[PDB]
Each structure stands twice: as structure tokens, then as C-alpha cells.
Amino acid sequence: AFKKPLSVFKGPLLHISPAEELYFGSTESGEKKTLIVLTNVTKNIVAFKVRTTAPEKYRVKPSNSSCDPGASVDIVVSPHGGLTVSAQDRFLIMAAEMEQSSGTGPAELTQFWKEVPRNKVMEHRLRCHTV
């Protein structure tokens, strides 16, 4: 509920917190987690996907979804039990703006990503800080 304050990267479609570096903290059960917050600063829905250099290592929720105009979405990232964060581990936020009144169900998002020209796709990288 209460979270550490985060820096901000201002992209054209999204503001992203933190701006560049992900720090992990412990939960009540001792598990390590970090938070990414995306804020859609456009007038239309923005579709987004989260990718990583270590796809077997992290739970990422949500990772393929959409953000409403003016709204924020929390993305929770945590290494699987027994795995430890490396400074080599990076995340990629990919995002693109949809049309007015676009649907955002899974099939609709899949079709959108097939159509969107690469030049319209915003990308921003984040890097893990060791624990």
C-alpha cells in the first residue's frame, strides 16, 4: 500500500517510475519485489508490454495489457524463490497509442501489435539494482 517514492522518466506516451534503476525491497513474507508505475499521458488508450533479459527469472504482472488515458498502472516484478537479482538484468517497456474507442481484450491487443508501425512504438529500458 505504502511504497517508496520514485523518480520519473517522461516519455511521449507514458511517464515511467522509476526513471531508470529498479530497487528491490522485502515484503511482509521476506520476498523481494520492485514496482514499476506507468502513467498514460495521452488522450487515448496506450497498449504496453513488458519484456526482460531474464524471462525465466522474474514474475512480471501485468506484462501485456493497456493503460487508460490519464490513469496509472502498477507493474509488480519479483524474482522467483531462490534466484537473486543481477545488475545485468534489464526490463523493456514497449508502448503504443491506440485509436479512440479501441477495444483492449487480448485478441484486440494482439491484432494491434501486429499492425502498429515500429515508428509509433515507444521503448524505454530499466535496469535492476542488486539487493
Residue-by-residue DSSP string for 26-55: E-TTS-EEEEEEEEE-SSS-EEEEEEES-T
> CA 62: distance to chain centroid?
8
φ, ψ dihedrals at 37, nearest 5°: -120, 130
Instruction: Identify the bridge partners of residue 72 per DSSP, sorted by sequence position.
Output: 39
Locate the domains of the chain by residue range. 9-100+119-128
Experimental method of this PDB entry:
X-ray
Q: Give CA separation, 93 vs 55, 62, 80, in Å.
A: 14, 12, 20
Q: What is the CA radius of gyration of the chain?
A: 15
Which amino acid is located at 104 in the chain? T
Which amino acid is located at 11 in the chain? G
> CA 97: distance to chain centroid?
15
C-alpha 104/C-alpha 116 separation (Å) is 14
C-alpha 106/C-alpha 65 separation (Å) is 8
CATH class, range 9-100+119-128 = mainly beta
* Helix intervals (H) in 1-131: 106-115
C-alpha 66/C-alpha 112 separation (Å) is 11
Half-sphere exposure for 89 (CA within 13 Å, toward CB): 20
Q: What is the DSSP letter of 100?
A: T
Nominal resolution (angstroms): 1.5
Burial of 85 from C-beta contacts in 10 A (0-12 / 13-18 / 19+): buried
Of 17, 48, 21, 23, the C-alpha closest to 116 is 48
